[PDB]
Design a protein around this motif. Structure first.
Motif, PDB file in Angstrom:
ATOM      1  N   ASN B 396     -77.513  72.088 -24.867  1.00  0.00           N
ATOM      2  CA  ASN B 396     -78.069  72.421 -23.555  1.00  0.00           C
ATOM      3  C   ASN B 396     -79.329  73.284 -23.701  1.00  0.00           C
ATOM      4  N   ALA B 397     -80.127  73.297 -22.641  1.00  0.00           N
ATOM      5  CA  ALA B 397     -81.385  74.051 -22.673  1.00  0.00           C
ATOM      6  C   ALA B 397     -81.807  74.477 -21.270  1.00  0.00           C
ATOM      7  N   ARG B 479     -74.814  75.764 -26.752  1.00  0.00           N
ATOM      8  CA  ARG B 479     -75.897  76.365 -25.950  1.00  0.00           C
ATOM      9  C   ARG B 479     -76.218  77.726 -26.579  1.00  0.00           C
ATOM     10  N   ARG B 481     -79.053  81.317 -25.893  1.00  0.00           N
ATOM     11  CA  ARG B 481     -80.190  81.987 -25.242  1.00  0.00           C
ATOM     12  C   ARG B 481     -80.301  83.425 -25.707  1.00  0.00           C
ATOM     13  N   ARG B 522     -82.387  76.267 -30.723  1.00  0.00           N
ATOM     14  CA  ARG B 522     -82.018  74.983 -30.081  1.00  0.00           C
ATOM     15  C   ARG B 522     -82.613  73.788 -30.846  1.00  0.00           C
TER      16      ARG B 522
END
Ligand SMILES: *[C@@H]1O[C@H](CO)[C@@H](O[C@@H]2O[C@H](CO)[C@@H](O[C@@H]3O[C@H](CO)[C@@H](O)[C@H](O[C@H]4O[C@H](CO)[C@@H](O)[C@H](O)[C@@H]4O)[C@@H]3O)[C@H](O)[C@H]2NC(C)=O)[C@H](O)[C@H]1NC(C)=O
Ligand SMILES: *[C@@H]1O[C@H](CO)[C@@H](O[C@@H]2O[C@H](CO)[C@@H](O[C@@H]3O[C@H](CO)[C@@H](O)[C@H](O[C@H]4O[C@H](CO)[C@@H](O)[C@H](O)[C@@H]4O)[C@@H]3O)[C@H](O)[C@H]2NC(C)=O)[C@H](O)[C@H]1NC(C)=O
Ligand code: 2QN
Ligand code: 2QN
Ligand SMILES: *[C@@H]1O[C@H](CO)[C@@H](O[C@@H]2O[C@H](CO)[C@@H](O)[C@H](O)[C@H]2NC(C)=O)[C@H](O)[C@H]1NC(C)=O
Ligand SMILES: *[C@@H]1O[C@H](CO)[C@@H](O[C@@H]2O[C@H](CO)[C@@H](O)[C@H](O)[C@H]2NC(C)=O)[C@H](O)[C@H]1NC(C)=O
Ligand SMILES: *[C@@H]1O[C@H](CO)[C@@H](O[C@@H]2O[C@H](CO)[C@@H](O)[C@H](O)[C@H]2NC(C)=O)[C@H](O)[C@H]1NC(C)=O
Ligand SMILES: *[C@@H]1O[C@H](CO)[C@@H](O[C@@H]2O[C@H](CO)[C@@H](O)[C@H](O)[C@H]2NC(C)=O)[C@H](O)[C@H]1NC(C)=O
Ligand SMILES: *[C@@H]1O[C@H](CO)[C@@H](O[C@@H]2O[C@H](CO)[C@@H](O)[C@H](O)[C@H]2NC(C)=O)[C@H](O)[C@H]1NC(C)=O
Ligand SMILES: *[C@@H]1O[C@H](CO)[C@@H](O[C@@H]2O[C@H](CO)[C@@H](O)[C@H](O)[C@H]2NC(C)=O)[C@H](O)[C@H]1NC(C)=O
Ligand code: NAG
Ligand code: NAG
Ligand code: NAG
Ligand code: NAG
Ligand code: NAG
Ligand code: NAG
Ligand code: CA
Ligand code: CA
Ligand code: CL
Ligand code: CL
Ligand code: ZN
Ligand code: ZN
Ligand code: ZN
Ligand code: ZN
Lengths: 690, 690
Positions: B396-397, B479, B481, B522
């Motif tokens: 995911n991004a 994922r 971040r 990522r």
């Protein structure tokens, strides 16, 4: 060399004969010690024959048996309560068979009860027979005992139909119209059913669930089981089968309304009056059932043999058929099991010389098929992830013969070309076709209804162990046997004590040549599926049938043009999807013919293998979660027959009778959308991958 | 050479900065012309960057918007019917933003209504907050308007909780306790939420369905849609969000019971009385909601880019993140989308020099994520068969940054080793860690709760576009971040008009170094997943967590020892399955380390790829058919959090309150059986194949 001809030439009629004899001397009822011993024997022999591994896979599933000390029977009872006629407690055993553990005729999974009432005769107890009774003749079955002749549709559909009509019991019987061929003698002098013969069989409506107590999961040691009140598919009224001597005694006193036409009359010397109840003098007599069978969780055993592939050991070609029988299983299943045994022996002979198939072959002797595909289905539930991702094809192997006239085949369209090509290379065993191919004899005797110079191949339905593999898991499946010239009623001695080795040896196949031809067809299919470099599936054959099925379902809908106008019911999306499938399949075929690269090959083999898988809808069909194939399902009116586009077919069935036409036509449109989507999604699996 | 270092070195902070600016100048609300133009721009640029194919995939899905000429607001209304206070009609726009199409704050999918009643304050409106109100404080929410602070759990759970408590409306507000960090200025002078700021967001409980009108099937041109009355996941009471200036006006007059303890008090200068209703002098005033939003089927557009694999083009590694935003999307999602854009540019640079990845990489710009993952889910429904059989991994991004302190990662155990190894090869961007690895800084700042010298990695839940791939389809997902030092509440300006390019450039990441580090994580994951000869998954890591999760669920059950005795509740099967998984995984790892044979390799790569797939149960979880993963599901109390062994967890939750303990404990045992079976079946996919 080690090629298909070597495999085929090693198969011998004399071995099949020896195995059939060995398999049919004692009963092998599911859940009994006799059937466990046979399992152990098969396991030992498959090891000896040369398989890499042979294991038993056991499960504890719900079975059903009569009570040995409280027998099932039916009476005519007078106003005083005296039982003035009783049906038989057993079939007269055949010559030479003081065998002790012969299960008496019963309907497996019938509840217990002693209902007493007036009889109504319902012909074959089909949906249309009940429509005729209730809508046309205005006869109410509520609180009545229904008597129905076996034939035409699966007996569980009859029972469901009777139950929904309000019947408090069902008596099933074999009419000589359906089970006595004119001019042939009854057993033991011919292959016809005697008046004391009775057809056993289960009456469940499992819709693919497998063991009634464990839908979705294998019935292993720690399984959580449904309470019996939540079990899948159990009937709510008692059921029992009888022979035509006993049926004649029940039917001869019938009064009320005349049969509505000649299609309701069998061959007994009775009026076939529909009832309800008996004629004037006997109007105060009743029929009373006495059913005391019990449902019992019981251990069953599959034998699973593996022949590891040399190149693609993670691709599985499965040959499976059952081993449990109602009594001796002379035809069902041991004529099939003897053929599987000789196929294993042949593959093992090649193995002992250093050969292995390209792909893995799995061989299965399933248990408890007679009680609703329980062994195959529990094993497939346990192994669903391996089968999902690795299963190439499943070839069934129940009865090899149900007649001696010609071949009968049901399979996915993906195998049509394989079957045509194989049968052109096999010798016909038929009188008058010496030196001709099996394709030639079969095509002459069973012509395709649509194509000149092709044989008939039918749609898979249910009624046998391929069901979980095909309709639940979406693995390409096929089946083939020798048949007669009432294709869903069974041969006369089906599920009777009279189905013996002598029946087959004397009357069906004395030279075991039809058995050998069936071994060559089933074994040859497995050989090609397991050995061909490119999987032997032709996607263009699916494109052809999808158009046929789309034309057929459109034509059903078009019987209601005003409603199609009112509710804007369009089949345009489905025809578009079929057109796309045709175009994409043609392009895929071109690429498959046009590519030294083993990744492109396997990539292409995976596209071929997952093509049947693409027709699976993970949400299942309405109220039938284990029937997941969108193109094919067992008919909702007859489990033995396949239906195409079943979700649309059932949405349209008797739609003119629905009291909310907006809702009913809405659901037709919903099913058209699901079918169009699934066909296009299946097509897209054949597109270039990136 | 063309290796990961070349890919990583081509990524530039300055490009990410330029893309973020380009993506955040105007709003890109799903379904609007502005967002379609951005889709077309991205499609054109991805082509220019060098992808093989870049297409738009469109769907017509249910969206929700305020009525432009009939605005939503809340009032305090006196006994005469005069509205004496009104909440704001819009957030004060930030400096330099006469931008016209800024959607005012609203709760997407709220029904219409004008309910008028007394307020009850319910803290965060969590399950335990309602337990405290109803069980301990004896406060009845029936017919009341509930006011709840945002934070801690997904807002849709709050709304469901309020609805089931009998509320006739819900007012959501941002308390400065949760959205105003001490010592930082509000926007535009700092990154805190001003008193006029408001958090937008949908309030559906879709449980993985995707478009509310088309569960199971893509919302294409011919799709049959549910009537709105049968739509999935819609709330039955009106809902609206407000800022803390307005909330203070609503809360300050609250009477009835004191807050039960300090965990119910936020930072506003009010008592946080629970109510119901206002204090004596204002007891006759009420609160009135005015909600006029409409649900509208609206076209959405995904951009799908393909980089075809050189060797395994039928294996897909997917990098996806959304493009639709509530307003400008400075952080959510354009900080993520700018990173995806630079990743595509980098892969395309290598492609233009003659390189291709081993496996196919798919790049996705999803639409309508903010309305419930609608774009990703419809596309995955359309392509489920391709994804099922070919999907290696999904990364995911969405937002690249929600703080500037350290890395945050949630992923399947299959990717733990990949993430550890990758982060040891990347430079830390953190002050004080110059010359150190990202693994070193991350491990120091976010230590694993169980292992010394390892970083924390969490369980995937929901709240973002990986949900369909992971929980429905069983494709390994991850994922990552940059985050802060209330991990489910969002950063202060989450879903507000104030989330702008300036917010990021001024206050979060002026040098775009945290963005660049996230692009390397990522992108590096995607590079390794798409290029490594053996898939970079370590099955032994799943064995370790499965034991942890089994210990945890056993410990929950063991709070009820008497019931476990009474109902014979044993976890023995589940521990046995976990033990077997551990043993089989260890043996598989040995074989994987020990095999020039591309079939054994791919066979082994397929075992690795289908391992996540094996945890899928085709029957789904109870009443949540689209959550099919047996190990992980989004928490039933908080969609953002993952729960382990969710079927057992939900069966045990609040079990002491169930009025039929036999039934409740039966269902616990059923869930133990399903979990034990699934773990053993997953293990068996790693056994030798034949
Ligand atoms: C069989 O394969 C063909 C491809 O060869 C495939 O064709 C696709 O058909 C769809 C559905 O009709 C087309 O969808 C259109 O897409 C365009 C943009 O490309 C839209 O602008 C269209 O929407 C407008 O028109 C509609 C109909 O009047 C309106 O309802 C709508 O509100 C818009 O005004 C429309 O969505 C699609 O472009 C083609 N794709 C092609 C040609 O590549 C067909 O769908 C396949 N059959 C099945 C059953 O899947
Ligand atoms: C973990 O893997 C192990 C394999 O290493 C696997 O062990 C299997 O356990 C089952 C379930 O206990 C065993 O099942 C037994 O099978 C024998 C025949 O082999 C039967 O005779 C046993 O039944 C008798 O005993 C039962 C218990 O007392 C009675 O309830 C029953 O009525 C019978 O009297 C029993 O079914 C199986 O043999 C082993 N397989 C081995 C050792 O190869 C284990 O199941 C795996 N864990 C999970 C959760 O799958
Ligand atoms: O006896 C069974 N099968 C028999 C049924 C024989 C009568 C109907 N024949 C067919 O459906 C048929 C169709 C194609 C072919 I090639 C061969 C036979 C068989 O397939 O040979 N299965 C049992 C158990 C059963 C399994 C699943 N569902 C219902 C019943 C039964 O029908 O009682
Ligand atoms: O805003 C959304 N997602 C945000 C939620 C931010 C607050 C909670 N954070 C987390 O769950 C989280 C967890 C791990 C990681 I690495 C990063 C963030 C996001 O994932 O960044 N999704 C929308 C839409 C949505 C999608 C699916 N289900 C519910 C809502 C919403 O929550 O309103
Ligand atoms: C069916 O064939 C099998 C195998 O030839 C027979 O079982 C063997 O019987 C002999 C003599 O009792 C034993 O020495 C072997 O141990 C058996 N082998 C097995 C079970 O693998 C069996 O007797 C035959 N059954 C009938 C009814 O003819
Ligand atoms: C049909 O079977 C029943 C049950 O065995 C017979 O009725 C029984 O007759 C015996 C002695 O003659 C009585 O003691 C039992 O009480 C009877 N049982 C019942 C349930 O009625 C009956 O005679 C048989 N009828 C015929 C014509 O053979
Ligand atoms: C059945 O046999 C036919 C005839 O041999 C096979 O069709 C041929 O296949 C080869 C190999 O691709 C082609 O070069 C020919 O053009 C084909 N002839 C045709 C279509 O008339 C067919 O593939 C076989 N079916 C199988 C193996 O499933
Ligand atoms: C975002 O960047 C894109 C691409 O550079 C800009 O769109 C281009 O704009 C120029 C000048 O109007 C045109 O000649 C091109 O046709 C556009 N290319 C596309 C759409 O691919 C766009 O102007 C930038 N947007 C903002 C707000 O800065
Ligand atoms: C809150 O907003 C409402 C709605 O606009 C205001 O009430 C209206 O006031 C006008 C003229 O002053 C009347 O003609 C409308 O009939 C009123 N509508 C309703 C629904 O009451 C109200 O004045 C505002 N209150 C405050 C304090 O600003
Ligand atoms: C992460 O890196 C470790 C250390 O390099 C890798 O583990 C090594 O893998 C090689 C190749 O199989 C083995 O020969 C070594 O024995 C391993 N070292 C160990 C386990 O300490 C590991 O495979 C990498 N993880 C990936 C690629 O997912
Ligand atoms: C079978 O019937 C006998 C004899 O009446 C009875 O004692 C026994 O309970 C029954 N067996 C069952 C129900 O399994
Ligand atoms: C049939 O009979 C019963 C009364 O004995 C009645 O309740 C039922 O509704 C009847 N059905 C019809 C269709 O007449
Ligand atoms: C076998 O074929 C012969 C010759 O047509 C026929 O008379 C006989 O009835 C057949 N047997 C069976 C069981 O159909
Ligand atoms: C929005 O409100 C206006 C103004 O009162 C009304 O005329 C229109 O019907 C509404 N639009 C909708 C419901 O989409
Ligand atoms: C709450 O209030 C209403 C009456 O206004 C009542 O019907 C409902 O049952 C009450 N619930 C409880 C738990 O007291
Ligand atoms: C960025 O880091 C600095 C230094 O610790 C901090 O003061 C600032 O608040 C951070 N920005 C955000 C948005 O957390
Ligand atoms: Ca089962
Ligand atoms: Ca959908
Ligand atoms: Cl068969
Ligand atoms: Cl993310
Ligand atoms: Zn059979
Ligand atoms: Zn049978
Ligand atoms: Zn987002
Ligand atoms: Zn968001």
């Amino acid at each position: 060399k080690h090629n298909m001809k070597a495999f085929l030439d090693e198969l011998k009629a004399e071995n099949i004969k020896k195995f059939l004899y060995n398999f049919t001397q004692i009963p092998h009822l599911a859940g009994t010690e006799q059937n466990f011993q046979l399992a152990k024997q098969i396991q030992s022999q498959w090891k000896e024959f040369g398989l890499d591994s042979v294991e038993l896979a056991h499960y504890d599933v719900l079975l059903s048996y009569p009570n040995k000390t409280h027998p099932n029977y039916i009476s005519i009872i007078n106003e005083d309560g005296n039982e003035i006629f009783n049906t038989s407690l057993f079939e007269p055993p055949p010559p030479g068979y003081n065998v002790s553990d012969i299960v008496p005729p019963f309907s497996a999974f019938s509840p217990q009860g002693m209902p007493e009432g007036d009889l109504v005769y319902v012909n074959y107890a089909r949906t249309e027979d009940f429509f005729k009774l209730e809508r046309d003749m205005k006869i109410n079955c509520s609180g009545k005992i229904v008597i129905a002749r076996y034939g035409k549709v699966f007996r569980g559909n009859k029972v469901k139909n009777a139950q929904l009509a309000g019947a408090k019991g069902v008596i099933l019987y074999s009419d000589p119209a359906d089970y006595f061929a004119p001019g042939v003698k009854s057993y033991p002098d011919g292959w016809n059913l005697p008046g004391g013969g009775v057809q056993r069989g289960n009456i469940l409506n499992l819709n693919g669930a497998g063991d009634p107590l464990t839908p979705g999961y294998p019935a292993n040691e720690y399984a959580y089981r449904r309470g019996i009140a939540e079990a899948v598919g159990l009937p709510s009224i008692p059921v029992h089968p009888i022979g035509y001597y006993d049926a004649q005694k029940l039917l001869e006193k019938m009064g009320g309304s005349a049969p509505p036409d000649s299609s309701w009359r069998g061959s007994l010397k009775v009026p076939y009056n529909v009832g309800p109840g008996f004629t004037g003098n006997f109007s105060t007599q009743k029929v009373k059932m006495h059913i005391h069978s019990t449902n019992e969780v019981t251990r069953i055993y599959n034998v699973i043999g593996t022949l590891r592939g040399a190149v693609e050991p993670d691709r599985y070609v499965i040959l499976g058929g059952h081993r449990d029988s109602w009594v001796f299983g002379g035809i069902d299943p041991q004529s099939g099991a003897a053929v599987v045994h000789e196929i294993v022996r042949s593959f093992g002979t090649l193995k002992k010389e250093g050969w292995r198939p390209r792909r893995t072959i799995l061989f299965a002797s399933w248990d408890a098929e007679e009680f609703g595909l329980l062994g195959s289905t529990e094993w497939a539930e346990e192994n669903s992830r391996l089968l999902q991702e690795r299963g190439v094809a499943y070839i069934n192997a129940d009865s090899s013969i149900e007649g001696n006239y010609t071949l009968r085949v049901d399979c996915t369209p993906l195998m049509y070309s394989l079957v045509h090509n194989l049968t052109k290379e096999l010798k016909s065993p038929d009188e008058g076709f010496e030196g001709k191919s099996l394709y030639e004899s079969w095509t002459k005797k069973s012509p395709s209804p649509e194509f000149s110079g092709m044989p008939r191949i039918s749609k898979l339905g249910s009624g046998n162990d391929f069901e979980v593999f095909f309709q639940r898991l979406g693995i390409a499946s096929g089946r083939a046997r020798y048949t007669k010239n009432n294709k869903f009623s069974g041969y006369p001695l089906y599920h009777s004590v009279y189905e013996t080795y002598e029946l087959v040896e004397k009357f069906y196949d004395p030279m075991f040549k039809y058995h050998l031809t069936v071994a060559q067809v089933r074994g040859g299919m497995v050989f090609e599926l397991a050995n061909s470099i490119v999987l032997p599936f032709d996607c263009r054959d699916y494109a052809v049938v999808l158009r046929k099925y789309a034309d057929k379902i459109y034509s059903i809908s078009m019987k209601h043009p005003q409603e199609m106008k009112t509710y804007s019911v369009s089949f345009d999306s489905l025809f578009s999807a079929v057109k796309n499938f045709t175009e994409i399949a043609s392009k895929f075929s071109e690429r498959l013919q046009d590519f030294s690269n083993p990744i492109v090959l396997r990539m292409m083999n995976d596209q071929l293998m997952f093509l049947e898988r693409a027709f699976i809808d993970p949400l299942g069909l309405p109220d039938r979660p284990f029937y997941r194939h969108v193109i094919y399902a067992p008919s909702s009116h007859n489990k033995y027959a396949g239906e195409s586009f079943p979700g649309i077919y059932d949405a349209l069935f008797d739609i003119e009778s629905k009291v909310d036409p907006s809702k009913a036509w809405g659901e037709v449109k919903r099913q058209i959308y699901v079918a169009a989507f699934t066909v296009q999604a299946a097509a897209e699996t054949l597109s270039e991958v990136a």
